[PDB]
Design a protein around this ligand. Structure first.
Ligand SMILES: [Mg+2]
Ligand SMILES: [Mg+2]
Ligand SMILES: [Mg+2]
Ligand SMILES: [Mg+2]
Ligand SMILES: [Mg+2]
Ligand SMILES: [Mg+2]
Ligand SMILES: [Mg+2]
Ligand SMILES: [Mg+2]
Ligand SMILES: [Mg+2]
Ligand SMILES: [Mg+2]
Ligand SMILES: [Mg+2]
Ligand SMILES: [Mg+2]
Ligand SMILES: [Mg+2]
Ligand SMILES: [Mg+2]
Ligand SMILES: [Mg+2]
Ligand SMILES: [Mg+2]
Ligand SMILES: [Mg+2]
Ligand SMILES: [Mg+2]
Ligand SMILES: [Mg+2]
Ligand SMILES: [Mg+2]
Ligand SMILES: [Mg+2]
Ligand SMILES: [Mg+2]
Ligand SMILES: [Mg+2]
Ligand SMILES: [Mg+2]
Ligand SMILES: [Mg+2]
Ligand SMILES: [Mg+2]
Ligand SMILES: [Mg+2]
Ligand SMILES: [Mg+2]
Ligand SMILES: [Mg+2]
Ligand SMILES: [Mg+2]
Ligand SMILES: [Mg+2]
Ligand SMILES: [Mg+2]
Ligand SMILES: [Mg+2]
Ligand SMILES: [Mg+2]
Ligand SMILES: [Mg+2]
Ligand SMILES: [Mg+2]
Ligand SMILES: [Mg+2]
Ligand SMILES: [Mg+2]
Ligand SMILES: [Mg+2]
Ligand SMILES: [Mg+2]
Ligand SMILES: [Mg+2]
Ligand SMILES: [Mg+2]
Ligand SMILES: [Mg+2]
Ligand SMILES: [Mg+2]
Ligand SMILES: [Mg+2]
Ligand SMILES: [Mg+2]
Ligand SMILES: [Mg+2]
Ligand SMILES: [Mg+2]
Ligand SMILES: [Mg+2]
Ligand SMILES: [Mg+2]
Ligand SMILES: [Mg+2]
Ligand SMILES: [Mg+2]
Ligand SMILES: [Mg+2]
Ligand SMILES: [Mg+2]
Ligand SMILES: [Mg+2]
Ligand SMILES: [Mg+2]
Ligand SMILES: [Mg+2]
Ligand SMILES: [Mg+2]
Ligand SMILES: [Mg+2]
Lengths: 94, 77, 46, 58, 103
RNA sequence: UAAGGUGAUAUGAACCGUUAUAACCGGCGAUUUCCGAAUGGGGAAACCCAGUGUGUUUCGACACACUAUCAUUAACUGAAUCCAUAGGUUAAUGAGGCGAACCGGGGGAACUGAAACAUCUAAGUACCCCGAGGAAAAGAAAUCAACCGAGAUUCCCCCAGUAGCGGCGAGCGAACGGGGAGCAGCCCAGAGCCUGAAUCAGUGUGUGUGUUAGUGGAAGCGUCUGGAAAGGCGCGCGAUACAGGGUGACAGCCCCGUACACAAAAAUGCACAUGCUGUGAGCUCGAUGAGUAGGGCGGGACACGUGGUAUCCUGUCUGAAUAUGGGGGGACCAUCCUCCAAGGCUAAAUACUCCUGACUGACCGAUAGUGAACCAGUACCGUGAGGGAAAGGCGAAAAGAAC
RNA sequence: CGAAGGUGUGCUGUGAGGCAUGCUGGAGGUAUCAGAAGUGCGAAUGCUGACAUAAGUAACGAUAAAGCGGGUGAAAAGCCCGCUCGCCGGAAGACCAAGGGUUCCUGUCCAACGUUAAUCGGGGCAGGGUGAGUCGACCCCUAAGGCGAGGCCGAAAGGCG
């Protein structure tokens, strides 16, 4: 059992890319940028409740922030988390 | 450490001085001996790491006298 | 030509690590002398 | 009073839930290039802070 | 606690345009104000693709120190200095000369 | 308190508010992820792995709280061994860690000087460890002094670089007493009478004065040079305000302020009284801190280096009278004088500033001044302790050069 | 109606120096008399910063080797494609564990880097990319070895177990 506050606060944003579009159009899979304390059992529940869409498995990966320079000082971006949510056949969303 | 439970004596520092007044650091140690004292009140022996002066103090005052002082001080016997 | 520095993260953290400097009481003095100086990196732990 | 101290704990919880839903919707809309008014995020976050503080006060 | 506000008529004391009158537009925290058509600068504005800005030389107002301006007393046509008093339990401004409350 | 605001490089977009829940400042509060004394176990710091209990449960399981060690207590069940101890479980209480300097203790050198060097000095200095407090320690005479007397302890100035110690070499260095800051003495070692007495205070309130946001705050014009006036030339005014800073060149009267007069919803410090939980007064009588003082053997501390060396402490061995008694008065004896150790508490003068507020400097002005006036203990070097920089100024206003 | 300072001229005093002024400079300087010094530099293989000399000299980093035809571009021997030559091939090939931490791909750029230029690159900017019940880490168990409840010892710290 998972509360609703966690399901509402776990998701951060969707992800826009050519690979994400190809995955959505050829394998029924969406790409979501989520938080760090997230888990597969929580992402699946959040997608099933908020979006009312069935999910079978979730593939999550962590992204390493890049080190850039704004002028002379150096700065490392935040390490965000990416999740691949595969939708069951027959369900569509955007 | 080499400490008298009764009198509180601990090793001290001094100097070895020869016939030419050469001073070398040295330590003065107590004459500690582990002895078993017979306490009649609890009908059991007790082991105490004391010196000969502590033994004379025990012989002059008594064992129950010293054990009560140890309990007041917080020492374990 | 084998130089003196052959890196190893585990061996580096076992010796020059915060958990090791907490023990070996003279490591607390090392940490204090860096905190008073204002070091940005007290140890090499990442 | 902010018209919320006179309410009940159940009403505050329901307001908490719908404010979180609105915050999630606004975040989803801001992630894509379609949201324009960004002050709503701060407003809803401060309202959530107010209601959560009132819950602790109760 | 401010003697100059965004809806007050003021006259310039010192500068290249002393003696000119106008209405201020805004008040800044750096002790500067913008007055209508007083301190004009021929700024060179470069075009940008965004907003389809064509550019061109633009006449724009410039910031002026508050100490270089003062309230204008239309009752006598002369400049005045602002003070503070209390009326009906509320702080209000008044002129140092002839003691007339600002309306 | 207020008509302007959403911190800076940093402009923008999107908004709030303009007579009072916009922002801002202060007080009281809540949330306060993880590592880190870290405290549920572990650990390559910001990581891993749990148990118990209570609550939810669309049965996928989720949420919260507790669970380290030590010491002092309370209860229960406890072994060798019968009563009884050791030991084990639970609950309550307190700390443990960090910090610039000051302090008291436990340890403790050398380079140097002596023109070498070992006694000595450097020095009980540097450094290590423990402890506690805004001060700490010490503190009420078994003290000095000299037949006259002072009366706790602490700090300053003289006594004095004198008397003294010292391979009498280098060097070390008092005390008596005087003049000053400051000031209060008590309690147990034990019983009885009066009966809750002065009394320290953590105790509860109000009163007064602050501190933590703040209010009012006087008095000027013309002309000239000049990019711009505060400058010059003239005429006026305020001042319990001509301390200071800013504003286009040097402003008492342009602005912020200043002299001065006021203000607290709420917490908090400081002085007084107040039922206030316990204190224990006052009187009579009695007692007077024993393996201690002294002594022997090998050391140290007192200006004092065993020297004729007086005095304090003990590492070891012994070792009394104890009110008719004992200690001290610089080897020691006699007389005389002074004082009652072997149990404790005690503020004020006195030492210091990591940090707060105000003010000042015949202090410095970017190779100076803190290492760092600037995104500095940063970049960088070394595995690591650690070492450690360089670098400031457009213009009054970016009006930062449309084309 | 032009201060300090900078750069020249003239005059003057036995001297260290002083005075006046042209130009740049654009806001402070200071008479006389006294007082206090971080008070005068050519050296110390003095310190910091800058600039010369040797000098446009050596060198441009394994003697495995390159030639040509087209393309983009302001410009090509070095960027792209194609046809030939040569080299390693128990490697000069392909996977990894250590270690490094975006250096991986695309678009774009040519100020600084590449010991030359460069349209190129591990060089600048922006964007994207790392998907595990079966791999590893996590986890069970221990070796050497560390810590170590209590415990023993130790002037404190602490040492052993
Ligand atoms: Mg899968
Ligand atoms: Mg010595
Ligand atoms: Mg802002
Ligand atoms: Mg208010
Ligand atoms: Mg507040
Ligand atoms: Mg833990
Ligand atoms: Mg632990
Ligand atoms: Mg010598
Ligand atoms: Mg000595
Ligand atoms: Mg007498
Ligand atoms: Mg000495
Ligand atoms: Mg005011
Ligand atoms: Mg005023
Ligand atoms: Mg004038
Ligand atoms: Mg100027
Ligand atoms: Mg003795
Ligand atoms: Mg003795
Ligand atoms: Mg003697
Ligand atoms: Mg004596
Ligand atoms: Mg004597
Ligand atoms: Mg004598
Ligand atoms: Mg006595
Ligand atoms: Mg006494
Ligand atoms: Mg400097
Ligand atoms: Mg300079
Ligand atoms: Mg080294
Ligand atoms: Mg000139
Ligand atoms: Mg000068
Ligand atoms: Mg000159
Ligand atoms: Mg000049
Ligand atoms: Mg002068
Ligand atoms: Mg000099
Ligand atoms: Mg020179
Ligand atoms: Mg030189
Ligand atoms: Mg040359
Ligand atoms: Mg050549
Ligand atoms: Mg040559
Ligand atoms: Mg040649
Ligand atoms: Mg050559
Ligand atoms: Mg060559
Ligand atoms: Mg080459
Ligand atoms: Mg070659
Ligand atoms: Mg070609
Ligand atoms: Mg080539
Ligand atoms: Mg071949
Ligand atoms: Mg071969
Ligand atoms: Mg590297
Ligand atoms: Mg890069
Ligand atoms: Mg590449
Ligand atoms: Mg590229
Ligand atoms: Mg070029
Ligand atoms: Mg090049
Ligand atoms: Mg090179
Ligand atoms: Mg690149
Ligand atoms: Mg994975
Ligand atoms: Mg496997
Ligand atoms: Mg083992
Ligand atoms: Mg232990
Ligand atoms: Mg061990």
């Amino acid at each position: 059992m998972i509360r609703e506050e966690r399901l509402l606060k776990v998701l951060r944003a969707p992800h826009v890319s050519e690979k994400a579009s190809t995955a959505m159009e050829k394998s029924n899979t969406i790409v979501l940028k989520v938080a760090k304390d997230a888990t597969k059992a929580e992402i699946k529940a959040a997608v099933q409740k908020l979006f009312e869409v069935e999910v079978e498995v979730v593939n999550t990966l962590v992204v390493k922030g890049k080190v850039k320079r704004h002028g002379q000082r150096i700065g490392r971006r935040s390490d965000w988390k990416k999740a691949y949510v595969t939708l069951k056949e027959g369900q569509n969303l955007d | 450490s080499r400490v008298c439970q009764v009198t509180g004596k601990r090793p001290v520092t001094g100097n070895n001085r020869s016939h030419a007044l050469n001073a070398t650091k040295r330590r003065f140690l107590p004459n500690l001996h582990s002895h078993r004292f017979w306490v009649e009140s609890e009908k059991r022996f007790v082991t105490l790491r004391v010196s000969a002066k502590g033994m004379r103090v025990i012989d002059k005052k008594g064992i129950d006298t010293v054990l009560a002082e140890l309990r007041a001080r917080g020492e374990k016997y | 030509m084998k130089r003196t520095f052959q890196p190893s993260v585990l061996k580096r953290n076992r010796s020059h690590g915060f958990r090791a400097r907490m023990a070996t009481k003279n490591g607390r003095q090392v940490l204090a002398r860096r905190r008073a100086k204002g070091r940005a990196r007290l140890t090499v732990s990442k | 009073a902010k018209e919320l101290r006179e309410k009940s704990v159940e009403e505050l919880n329901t307001e908490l839930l719908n404010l979180l839903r609105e915050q999630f919707n606004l975040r989803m809309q801001a992630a894509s290039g379609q949201l324009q008014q960004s002050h709503l995020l701060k407003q809803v976050r401060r309202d959530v802070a107010r209601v959560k503080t009132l819950l602790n006060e109760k | 606690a401010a003697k100059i506000r965004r809806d007050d008529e003021v006259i310039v004391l010192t500068g290249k345009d002393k003696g000119k009158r106008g209405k201020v537009k805004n008040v800044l925290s750096s002790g500067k104000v913008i007055v209508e058509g007083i301190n004009l600068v021929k700024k060179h504005q470069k075009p940008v693709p965004a907003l389809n800005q064509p550019g061109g030389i633009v006449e724009k107002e410039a910031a002026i120190q508050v100490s270089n301006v003062a309230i204008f007393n239309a009752a006598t046509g002369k400049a005045d200095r602002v003070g503070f008093r209390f009326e009906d339990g509320k702080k209000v401004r008044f002129f140092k000369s002839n003691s007339e409350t600002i309306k």
